[PDB]
C-alpha cells in the first residue's frame, strides 16, 4: 500500500519517489502529489484461490464480452496455482 | 446509394449571389426529401465490410 519515504513523500504503486536531493519535488510545494491508494498488487492478492475439478480451466475475467480474451489455464503442477495472465485470478485443481 | 434516391438539382439563372442563395436554400429542402427516403429504405444487416 501507500508507504512514505524518509522525506515524507508518498511512494507510488510503481515505486516512484523523489529522493532527498531531487529539486523536482519543489513542484509539490503548496500543492500535492497525486497518488492512487488502491494498489492493484495488494487487491488481487486478497482474492481467494478457486478450487476446480479439472486439469484445464478457462478464464474470461467475468462479465462475458466485458472481460478479457478467454484463456485456458493448465493446472497440472501441484506446487503452484494457475494464474490468469490477464486478470490475475488464481485456480487450483482439487484432489489431483 | 445516391442513384436510389429521388431529388432535384436547383439551378440558377443569373449567376449572382442571390441565385446562389436560392440554390442553397432549395438544396436544404432536397436534403430533407432525401432524408425522408433514407429513413424509409434503411435496410437491415451489418454496418461494416465482413472482411476482418
Amino acid at each position: 500500500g501507500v508507504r512514505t519515504s524518509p522525506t515524507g513523500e508518498k511512494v507510488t504503486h510503481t515505486g516512484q519517489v523523489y529522493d532527498d536531493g531531487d529539486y523536482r519535488k519543489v513542484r509539490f510545494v503548496g500543492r500535492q502529489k497525486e497518488v492512487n491508494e488502491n494498489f492493484a498488487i495488494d487487491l488481487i492478492a486478497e482474492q481467494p484461490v478457486s478450487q476446480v475439478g479439472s486439469r484445464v480451466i478457462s478464464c474470461d475475467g467475468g462479465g462475458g464480452a466485458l472481460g478479457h480474451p478467454r484463456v485456458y489455464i493448465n493446472l497440472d503442477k501441484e506446487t503452484k496455482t494457475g494464474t490468469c495472465g490477464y486478470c490475475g485470478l488464481q485456480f487450483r485443481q482439487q484432489h489431483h | 446509394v445516391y442513384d436510389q434516391v429521388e431529388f432535384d438539382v436547383p439551378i440558377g439563372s443569373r449567376g449572382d449571389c442571390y441565385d446562389r442563395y436560392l440554390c442553397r436554400v432549395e438544396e436544404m429542402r432536397q436534403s430533407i426529401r432525401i432524408i425522408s427516403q433514407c429513413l424509409n429504405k434503411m435496410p437491415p444487416g451489418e454496418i461494416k465490410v465482413d472482411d476482418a
Binding site: - | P44, G45, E46, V49, D50, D51
Partner: protein
C-alpha cells in the same frame, strides 16, 4: 406547449402559420433515453463452410 390560447393565436397570426403543430422545442415525442438492448446481425462471411477467404 404551455402558451395560452391568446398568445397562441397572436403568434400564429403574426407568423401566418399554425406554429403549434410543429413546435421547434421537443416534448414527449422523442424516444426514450433508455432502450432495450440490441441484437445486431452478422455479415455474409459468417459461415462455417464454403467460406474460404481466397474466394472473397
Amino acid at each position: 406547449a404551455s402558451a395560452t390560447r391568446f398568445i397562441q393565436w397572436l403568434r400564429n397570426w403574426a407568423s401566418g402559420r399554425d406554429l403549434q403543430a410543429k413546435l421547434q422545442l421537443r416534448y414527449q415525442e422523442i424516444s426514450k433515453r433508455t432502450q432495450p438492448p440490441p441484437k445486431l446481425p452478422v455479415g455474409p462471411s459468417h459461415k462455417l463452410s464454403n467460406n474460404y477467404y481466397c474466394t472473397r
